[PDB]
From a paper:
Here we characterize a metal-dependent, bifunctional isoprenyl diphosphate synthase from the leaf beetle Phaedon cochleariae by structural and functional analyses. Isoprenyl diphosphate synthase in P. cochleariae (PcIDS1, EC 2.5.1.1) produces FPP in the presence of Mg2+, but preferably forms GPP when exposed to the heavy metal ions (HMIs) Co2+ or Mn2+. Inter- and intramolecular cooperative effects in the homodimer strongly depend on the provided metal ions and regulate the biosynthetic flux of terpene precursors to either biological defence or physiological development. Strikingly, a unique chain length determination domain adapts to form geranyl or farnesyl pyrophosphate by altering enzyme symmetry and ligand affinity between both subunits.
Stabilized by cation–π interactions with R427, the F315 side chain positions IPPHAl for nucleophilic attack. V286 and I420 form the bottom of this specificity pocket and act as a molecular ruler, whereas F282 and F315 engage in π-stacking with both allyl groups.
Author numbering:
A (entry chain B): 87 to 108, 112 to 189, 203 to 327, 334 to 427
B (entry chain A): 87 to 107, 111 to 329, 334 to 427
Write the structure that this text describes.
Amino acid sequence: SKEESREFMAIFPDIVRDLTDATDIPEVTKRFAKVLQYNVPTGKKTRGLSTVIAYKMLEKPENLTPENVRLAGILGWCVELLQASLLIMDDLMDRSETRRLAINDCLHVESSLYSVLRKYFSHLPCYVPIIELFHDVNFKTNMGQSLDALCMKDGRPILSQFTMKRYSSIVKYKTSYYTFQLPVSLGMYLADMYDPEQHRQAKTILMEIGEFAQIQDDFLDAFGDVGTDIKEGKCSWLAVVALQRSNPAQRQIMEEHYGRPEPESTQIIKNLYIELGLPATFAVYEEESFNIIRTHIHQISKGLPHDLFFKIMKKIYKR
Amino acid sequence: SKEESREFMAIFPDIVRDLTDHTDIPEVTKRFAKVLQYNVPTGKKTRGLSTVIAYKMLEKPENLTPENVRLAGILGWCVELLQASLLIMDDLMDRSETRRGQPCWYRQENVGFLAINDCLHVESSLYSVLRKYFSHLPCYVPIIELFHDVNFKTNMGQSLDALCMKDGRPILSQFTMKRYSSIVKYKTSYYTFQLPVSLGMYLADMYDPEQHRQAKTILMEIGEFAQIQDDFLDAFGDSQVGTDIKEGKCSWLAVVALQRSNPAQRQIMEEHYGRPEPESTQIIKNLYIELGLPATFAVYEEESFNIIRTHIHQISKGLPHDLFFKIMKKIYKR
Ligand SMILES: CC(C)=CCC/C(C)=C/COP(=O)(O)OP(=O)(O)O
Ligand SMILES: CC(C)=CCC/C(C)=C/COP(=O)(O)OP(=O)(O)O
Ligand SMILES: [Mg+2]
Ligand SMILES: [Mg+2]
Ligand SMILES: [Mg+2]
Ligand SMILES: [Mg+2]
Ligand SMILES: [Mg+2]
Ligand SMILES: [Mg+2]
Ligand SMILES: [Mg+2]
Ligand SMILES: [Mg+2]
């Protein structure tokens, strides 16, 4: 929506002023403003806007005031502050050139979302549930990143670690919690929905959608119409399934050419992915997962709305 | 105190179990146990123990139960978790070889820049400890908010320190007493001195902002001497070794040197400060001797002690003077 996107983006200048003491240390406060301005507001803001959409579809229609929708927008920006911190750090860790300037900037940007929460939410019933959610998601996200790191040793991928169980765990902890669960749980808490069973049923569907989302992203990295997962030796769905299907000779090709800088080695891996019928395997998985997720959304109870979860599902599958 | 130290150290293994004992990912929880065991419990736990001591001197004697003193201990370990996360990061940022004898965590087999994740993880973990033990107590939200605020303030301090360096060379024009004082306050004094006392006050259900304000004033003054003394001893302490000069740090010695230096002496600092060659460290140390920095420190130690003691005598409301005198004595060693 034009109205939702514009109202959301209009909050950002306020967040910057809130976090930059708008003081005895103006030069470092001015620097932090530039850290936020470079790293937080550019690009799509899907997690932030999903927080507003979630609240709008969970809250009673009578309670949807401009004031409440703005609070949902502020929670959205706290998710985008978390996103920014993860993006700053991961790029240092993976020594990435581009995405789409100091080390402690990721700790600072992460820490800043709790100042925003304190400013706007400290007098509301949802305050402690929301801070505890952010605390738990950062802890779990770190466990995800560390599990991902345990698939690499001395710059070489550990292909024995490339199991579907470990992959599913990496996606859940590293990505799905903060990307899919966090926005919806935030929307629920702001709508004064605290029922554990409601959060649990939401979590189940969102982790399923999250897993397909990342598998699709992994697939498109190699087979989309420019991906470097193979070169970076990433624990990708393609690599995990390739090893499941591989005969000893196909396993040797992975062991020799996966996670190499030479463009020829990337091309060799893609050729093996084609030989192993990974495109067909993805098509089957996309159909099966869509039908299972559609079923689980139809089955959603505990007084949760289906349209929210269908909207999230549609955005990912694009049908 | 043997009993205090032993009681405090006995809590750590429970905290490791609280944070690592997520049954579907055993390898990462086992790794995190090791991250905590390497980085958190070894050497002096001065900040952690100071939290217990603060509480014991703030709380009503009748309320000092084994249970409450343990809660004070757990808050102290939350300070040590924050400490461990900061030192993990700072070592990567400064590319230091050792800290407290131990090789820096980032230098360990297959860590490097993954120390950023470990930094974030250890900092995050203290909030899990707070939830387990404090979620039901009135002090819960004030303590959570204090930890988040101190984290934010510490990051401002580290960034200000970083703005005294460019391309691995110190910016001597940035080495002013006003910027130095700000670095020490934000980077060190908040988490080292303010956080332990404020935690003790909150656990003793002391929420009066004016009490916290009066405490902060005194603790920032004691904190400033503590870092100046540490900076002095880096160059002039008996090793039986300080690398502040080699590292080109914004040290009290470097700041006061630049105040007292004639153009010729200013050129020695510009030429030799922050260089790796041992001869350059010798030249700076010799310039500090020439400029009479030892005498200058001796006068400051005497004058700051007297000024702070006066300020403690004038502390208002129901704050115990004895707590601030004990902190003073521990730092000045008199
Ligand atoms: C540091 C942490 C906790 C990250 C969690 C979320 C995240 C953005 C991971 C990086 O993805 P990736 O490195 O697998 O891929 P890419 O960098 O290509 O997005
Ligand atoms: C936000 C962060 C990461 C803050 C770091 C704070 C800190 C205690 C650093 C050490 O200071 P230093 O580097 O001047 O001294 P040393 O490393 O010698 O103790
Ligand atoms: Mg990564
Ligand atoms: Mg990456
Ligand atoms: Mg990438
Ligand atoms: Mg990808
Ligand atoms: Mg250092
Ligand atoms: Mg440093
Ligand atoms: Mg020192
Ligand atoms: Mg050092």
